[PDB]
C-alpha cells in the first residue's frame, strides 16, 4: 500500500541506499512506522500491510543529507519530508522524490 | 533580508497569494522553537522574516500551508504542508531564498544561496 | 530501450492515453521515428528496438496539451519537447515526465 | 517587459548565468521565425527580449541552450536544451516570465502569467 521511489537529477539514476523513515502522528507527536533503505532501482517496497496501514496523517523522511555526502556534493536540505493524510478509503501510495543538490520535487501517485 | 520565501500556483501560472509560512529554528534541547511567520503578498512572496542580527547559524525549518491555500480554492490536495529543513550560515551569513512550486499532488522547492 | 512515463500532478495519478511522438534528426531536419499514446499506468513501452536505436540526437514530444483539453483545464503548453543525444554506448532511457497545467518537469533515467 | 527568462541552477543553489536564449515565433507558413535571443544576467534573468507593440499573438518557441552552460561547468548533460512552446496573448495582451530550473538530468519549467 506505500512505496518510496527516489531519482538522482545530477546522475540521471535512481537514488540507492537512501534511508527513508516513516512515522504516524500519534493522539498527542511523530511515532516511528516503518523505515528501509531504497534498492538498486530506487524503490522502497514492503514498508507496510494492508491492515496496517490505518486512515491519520502520516510522515516520509527520506535522508538526502547522507546521499549527497556520500557522492561528495554539498546538499542544502537536512532531508526531504513528506506529509499527508492516508485514505481519507484505502489506495496504493507511490511517494516518489527527485532529487538534486539545491532542490527537490515529491509527487504522490494515488491508485 | 537574509530570508524570502516565494510560493508559485502551478495550476494557474500565478503567485500564490495569502500562503501561511511558519519558521522554527532547532534548540539546544533538539526542539522545534518559533522563529518568525508571515503571508505571502499579491507577489506571492514573503519578505520580513528576519534580520541579519537574529538569523544565526542554526538548522531552519519552513513550513509552508499548502494544504489551507488548495482546500479555499476547492482542491482536496495530497500533502499537509512542504515543509523545508536546512542548516543555514555554516560558513558565514548567506541570504537565502526558498522557492516553492505547487499543485495539488506535488510540490517542488528549490534554494538560492547567495553572498 | 527507450521508455516514456507521465504523471499528471493535479490528480496524482498517471497521465493516460497521453499521445508521444518521437524524431531522430536527421542529416539536413526532423524525422518522424515512433509514437504511441501512454497505457493506464501512464507508461509507453515498445517504441524502438535495440538494433534501430543508433547514436543520433532525438526528440521526445509529448502531447500535453490535448490530455489538459479532455480534462477541461486550460494549459500554457503547447507540448512538452525533451531532445537528447543517445548513446554517446546502448544504454536504457526512461523519460519521465510530470505534467502540471503551467508547468512540467522531465528527467531522464540512464540505467 | 511582456517577457522575460529567469533561469536557476539546481546543482549551485544559483542563478544560470550567461545562458544563451533564442526566442521564435511560428509564421503563417508554419515554419519557425527567428524572434529575439538574449543571454542571462548575473542574476539569471534575461530582460528586454521584445516590446509590448511586438509582441502579438502567436505561438511562441523559447530554446534555452542549457547544454553549453553545464558543458561548461564541467558536466556532459542529458539535454540538448530546454525548449518552451506556447501560445500569448490569446485572450488579450499579458506578462509572461518563463522560469526554468536546471540540473544536469533533469529540468522543470514554470510560467507566470499575469495583466
Ligand atoms: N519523479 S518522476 O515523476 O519523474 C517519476 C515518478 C515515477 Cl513513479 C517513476 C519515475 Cl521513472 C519517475
Known amino acids: 500500500p506505500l512505496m518510496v521511489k527516489v531519482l538522482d537529477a545530477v546522475r540521471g539514476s535512481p537514488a540507492i541506499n537512501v534511508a527513508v523513515h516513516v512515522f504516524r502522528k500519534a493522539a498527542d507527536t511523530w511515532e516511528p512506522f516503518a523505515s528501509g533503505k531504497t534498492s ?21 523522511e527520506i535522508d538526502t543529507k547522507s546521499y549527497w555526502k556520500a557522492l561528495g556534493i554539498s546538499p542544502f536540505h537536512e532531508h526531504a519530508e513528506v506529509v499527508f493524510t492516508a485514505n481519507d478509503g484505502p489506495r496504493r501510495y507511490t511517494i516518489a522524490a527527485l532529487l538534486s543538490p539545491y532542490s527537490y520535487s515529491t509527487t504522490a501517485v494515488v491508485t
Not at 538498486?40 to 516520509?60: A, Q
Open 40 to 60: 538498486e532501482s530506487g524503490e522502497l517496497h514492503g514498508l507496510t500491510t494492508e491492515e496496517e496501514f490505518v486512515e491519520g496523517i502520516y510522515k516520509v
